[PDB]
Amino acid sequence: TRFEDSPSYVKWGKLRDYQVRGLNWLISLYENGINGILADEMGLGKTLQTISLLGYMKHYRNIPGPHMVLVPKSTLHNWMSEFKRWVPTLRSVCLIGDKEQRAAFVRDVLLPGEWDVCVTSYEMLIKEKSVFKKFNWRYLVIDEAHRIKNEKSKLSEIVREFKTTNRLLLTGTPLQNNLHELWSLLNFLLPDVFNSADDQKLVERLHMVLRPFLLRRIKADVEKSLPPKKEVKIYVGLSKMQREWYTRILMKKMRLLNILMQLRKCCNHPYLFDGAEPGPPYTTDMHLVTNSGKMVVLDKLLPKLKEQGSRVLIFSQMTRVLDILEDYCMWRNYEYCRLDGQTPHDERQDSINAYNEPNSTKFVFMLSTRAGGLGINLATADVVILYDSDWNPQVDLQAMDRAHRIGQTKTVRVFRFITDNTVEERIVERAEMKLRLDSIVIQQ
Amino acid sequence: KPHRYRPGTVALREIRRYQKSTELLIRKLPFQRLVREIAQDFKTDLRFQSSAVMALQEASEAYLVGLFEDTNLCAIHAKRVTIMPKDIQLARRIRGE
Amino acid sequence: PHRYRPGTVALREIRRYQKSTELLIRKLPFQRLVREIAQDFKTDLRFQSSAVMALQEASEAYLVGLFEDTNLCAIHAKRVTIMPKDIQLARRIRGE
Amino acid sequence: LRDNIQGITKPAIRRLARRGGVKRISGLIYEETRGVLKVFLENVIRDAVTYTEHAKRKTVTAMDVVYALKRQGRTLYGFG
Amino acid sequence: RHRKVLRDNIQGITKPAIRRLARRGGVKRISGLIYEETRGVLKVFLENVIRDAVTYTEHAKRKTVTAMDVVYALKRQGRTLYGFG
Amino acid sequence: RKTRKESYAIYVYKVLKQVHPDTGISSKAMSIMNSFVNDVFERIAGEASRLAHYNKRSTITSREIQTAVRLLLPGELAKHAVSEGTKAVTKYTSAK
Amino acid sequence: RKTRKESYAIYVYKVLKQVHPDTGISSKAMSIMNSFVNDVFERIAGEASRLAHYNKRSTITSREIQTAVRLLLPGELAKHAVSEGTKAVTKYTSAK
Amino acid sequence: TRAKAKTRSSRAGLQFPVGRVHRLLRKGNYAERVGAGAPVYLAAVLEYLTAEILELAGNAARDNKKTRIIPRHLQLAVRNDEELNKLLGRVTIAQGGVLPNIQSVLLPK
Amino acid sequence: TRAKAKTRSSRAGLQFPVGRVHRLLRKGNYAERVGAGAPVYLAAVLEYLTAEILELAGNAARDNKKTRIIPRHLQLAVRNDEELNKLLGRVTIAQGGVLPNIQSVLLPK
DNA sequence: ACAGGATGTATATATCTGACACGTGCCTGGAGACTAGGGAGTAATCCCCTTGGCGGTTAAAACGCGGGGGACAGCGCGTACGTGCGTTTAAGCGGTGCTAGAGCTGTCTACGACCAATTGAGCGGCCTCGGCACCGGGATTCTCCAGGG
DNA sequence: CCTGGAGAATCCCGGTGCCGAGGCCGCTCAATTGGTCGTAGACAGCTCTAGCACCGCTTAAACGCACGTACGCGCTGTCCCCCGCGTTTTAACCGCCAAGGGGATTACTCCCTAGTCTCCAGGCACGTGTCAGATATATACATCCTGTGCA
Ligand SMILES: Nc1ncnc2c1ncn2[C@@H]1O[C@H](COP(=O)(O)OP(=O)(O)OP(=O)(O)O)[C@@H](O)[C@H]1O
């Protein structure tokens, strides 16, 4: 019904068959006049398809007026650079900076309306909802649709109150822990259709109702490249002092308002808590490892991963642990790069992009469960180390497959540390259940 | 050369501004942390309804404002403008605390 | 001619009256004052002796406390004499 | 009954001041003390007379005085 | 090794905050040694109120201090508060 | 379903409508007025109960409420409130 | 004859003979002690009534008395009074 | 049958819940028996006090160029009026602020 | 038949009347019901407070070389014990006097 | 001493939004009608206690005067605080994830109200004596001039 | 400027008298003992609401620092006011008497309020929309401070 090979107006774009068929599918969805969800987890890209969609909408029957793209602030410069490189015919503007900078921007750009695509962040959108509500919208592009997964959130209300003729949601993790998230997404797409919250009342009916306006293609089933990862769990024990502290915490001066939280990271490292927290900073010497069996095991496992490859990209669950280990691996006897929420974003982007290096000989690099977004592949990363698992399995999946870009042509390895007769196994089994639910919903 | 208000104009401006308003002046999170630390001594494992901390903050603000009024009165009695801990102690002693 | 310094007799009187426990206001004038004040609120009122005694006791205690606060105010003001403005400051801070 | 506030004399006020703990007294203190005594007594007597009126009597009792003082927050021990 | 405590909670209330309170009171010039005394006085007042409120909560067999408990404690102390129950 | 709570909000709004016709009120103002009415009711009821206990009676009556009003309210307010209460009792008793 | 009057005088005398076997008391001091006992009774009972009303209960119990004592008495007085009351209630339960 | 029910508040010419006040008096453990006219008298006194306070608050709100009454207007009305100030001396009105008052010694001259 | 009546105070080993306290609680309009242990608890508290104040007053009386407690001795004990002073902060004791203290500034050179 | 320049504030106008004012539907408590009982009003009588008067006495107040010390106005100074400016940080708001704890329903039991008989505990009255108030007299200590230190 | 007397003021010891404290009786009324019953609260169960621990981003607020200026404080002189003491009135204090008012008790009656049942309507929870208030932004105005002849 539409083009079968690369569109003539793309500049140097090399979108393949899956990309062109997704473009045709989105064009047909626009034709029939319904919104949709582009559920491409990875290996396919959504930025290219979205930019190609908007470029087609401009270079065909004219609709060059207002258009809104919602991105996290951490990827705005990347989005603008990719847009300029790929399709430079359209004009793009960005809403950033403080109050006076955004006032300068609205005055010198927004009122004249010489722009086709407007790229901003969630926070700026909340700040300037009133300024943005004076303009009609024809194709609202939002990435990471799980950002509006729940109702009663301010962003959900703001985006609902917006006036958009059509909508487009980009998400790689369509389901997290329950069907009310997919219901929220579908209700935002079609409020007049999915008004009510309502094996046959399940699974299969869900598949049938999601088929018409959803796309889900596996990177392995499309390209057959990107050799699959190997996932290994390591059943780690815990020290006797760790057990004693775990007991004295569990059965009961220190504050333990949230009992599950305060009887949790205990297995990660004992001295994370107060009371027995590191005392006088004697020096950076051998005191931290000897008190925790998990880091003892990590130290024992280091040499084999060090003998070759050795870019790890270790993952931990506690920021406390991430930052201490970030400033710790340098002292241990290695070189590192640091990623955290305390690092500024504008510097962060170029910093990580430049830190992507053919030869570093540094052996360590640490990213938090949240601090890592979606981008920047280290082809040298081989062995994934999961110190502790988060409740959300999709966050763990994102942390695992952030190294599963094409930039990575080697089989990648995953290491998992698990304690025994503790709540870490509880978190693991809950994550397994949620991951299985997501798999059955989005694959069967 | 740059414009410089004399020492005592901005104080009067702030006095009028703050006597004109009604909102709270202490920071909510520090006040809540102080309240929880005090409650720890009396009993551990305590939860605070969000309205209780607001009521405590309101009462603390009223008490401090009234005390400062009386302390200013004591300082004016001593033929001074600066208020002092001796003035505060005298005011508390007279009020019966 | 023997004459004490101006201020030692005051200290002796202070000590003696702080040691003593009896009333200091003349009973008959206080009784007449009470009856005169009560004449405003009611006509031809009779009183028990214990009622007048309790009124006198309460008045004495209130005035002693007021004078103590006034002395504190005067000492704060770098003085040893008490003044009507000291009494007014004491009343204002006490709550009148 | 007229001008009985003059019955409360300067020596009595000086004795009260000495018991309070003051050394020097200004000459204008006496009128102020008479005024404060007047207002205090007026309040207490008003409340006691109200109690007597409710009791439907014509005599004011020590119990009525104690009740008035307890209303004002000046509890008296030793009269009932 | 990087592990230490930041600041104790009594210093949570700040010198500019105490200055704002004194401005609302009516104070024009403030001595430098007023802030520690203000912190002590506030600590004592809060201790009394919180003791009474925790006693009420303990009697109710609850573990959540409520606005009603705070109001009852303030009324017992003699500082009736209007606007919470 | 939540258990209903009794508030004087409707009656206070009727009084406000009678006093200032075109004038509203805020939620916190309504709460403050409700608390004020509760406090005044508690004060007067406690005073009346203590009065009845002192006089060795078992009934709180209009005389007790009047005496409590005169003891609590300050002067002119007490006078006008007494007039209003007497008028209300007269209306409730005249032909009812 | 004269209608009977009630006082805690005999019990105060018993406690005095207990703590100090060779010390006497006067009528004024006995009246003061009687007033003190009445005042403490009134305060504790009123606080307990307020507590029972607040918790929506219609019975005064040992728990309410203990809580009122904790509210009213300061510090060491509260601690020792609670210990004494608990011991007395334990003995009464045992000997019933 | 039975006649049409007239509320005792409507009978007494009041605007306050005479029946609710009667129930509160009987349920407050104030005494054993309660008279018939006592709740009516108490409701009338409450009505007068509320009306005076609302009148002063409305005057203040009209002065401040506003229609809705806020706790600031309530506190402003309660203060600046000696009778109500004496009645409500020990109470604190939330978010009512403080009266504008600067001692003349501080004012430059 | 029955047995010899045992007083509740004797059963609890108290010198204060549990029965009289119970009657006063019933006739006090405090609550509709009164538990069995509440009068015992109240009597123990009253006895302890009386014992403390009487011990302090008797020590003061012996210190003054008299064998009869008077309101002066009671006042001295109450004002010298800080817990009892806080309990009786706003209480006046007839024929009590005041504590002897002279401000250090008024003492001569 | 004014003129003028630089801040701050009061004011008018246009948008926007969320809290208030009103509606609707239902349900729990207030009103109507009646019956019993005991609390309180009402009358009468007793006695005590408050008031008015009067006389004698002596302590306390009123009055005058000399003199010292404390209040008060003035001057000088050094310094701690107020003002402004630049840099850092953590509060505030928006989300995530979890579960504990409050609040309402329902059943059962054991505990306190109520009543009747009995009795000893406590209260009013009465009497005696010894602890305390008062007085006197001697011993002790504190204060204030005079001057030689 | 530290000693030394002289003079009041105070305390300690002993003797005397008086009135209130402490012990002892009668009786009557409130507390004790026994038995019954019904309702308030204890205990168990369940739902869902809210509270606690933690992340990212923004930005107002806090923190630190330099300069200078009113302000607190120490000191000095003046003078007038308060105190100490002696003297004269004045009225409080105490003892005694007489009379009448009014507080307190007792008996009798009735009328007002508790308790019940029945029903219905006023009051509350819940939705929903629109207008009063909050805010931004651009004028006009008031105020403060400092420089320039003459004060
Ligand atoms: N121009 C292209 N031509 C062909 N394949 C491409 C192109 N760009 C991206 N891809 C495919 O997409 C993979 C990753 O693309 P990219 O990093 O742009 O993803 P993304 O936009 O971050 O993903 P998501 O869809 O989850 O937002 C590559 O490894 C490759 O297989």
Numbering used by the authors:
A (entry chain W): 166 to 363, 377 to 430, 443 to 634
B (entry chain A): 37 to 133
C (entry chain E): 38 to 133
D (entry chain F): 22 to 101
E (entry chain B): 17 to 101
F (entry chain H), G (entry chain D): 27 to 122
H (entry chain G), I (entry chain C): 10 to 118
Task: Quote the original article.
All known remodeler enzymes use an Snf2-type ATPase motor to slide nucleosomal DNA around the histone octamer, but the precise underlying mechanism is unclear. Here, we use cryo-electron microscopy (cryo-EM) to visualize the continuous motion of nucleosomal DNA induced by human chromatin remodeler SNF2H, an ISWI family member. We merged the datasets from all conditions and performed extensive data analyses to determine 13 unique structures of the active SNF2H bound to the nucleosome. Based on the conformations of DNA at SHL2 and of SNF2H, we clustered our 13 structures into five groups (A to E).
In group A (ATP hydrolysis, 15% of A-D particles), DNA and SNF2H adopt a conformation overall similar to that in the structures of nucleosome-remodeler complexes with ADP-BeFx. The DNA at SHL2 is pulled out by 1–2 Å relative to the canonical nucleosome structure and the density for nucleotide bound to SNF2H is in a position similar to that of ADP-BeFx11, which is consistent with either ATP or ADP-Pi occupancy. However, we observe a gradual rotation of SNF2H lobe 2 towards SHL3, relative to the ADP-BeFx-bound structure, starting in the A1 structure and becoming more pronounced in the A2 and A3 structures. These features indicate that group A structures represent conformational states downstream of the ADP-BeFx-bound state. Compared to A3, the SNF2H lobe 2 in the B1 structure continues to rotate toward SHL3, whereas the brace helix and lobe 1 remain stable.
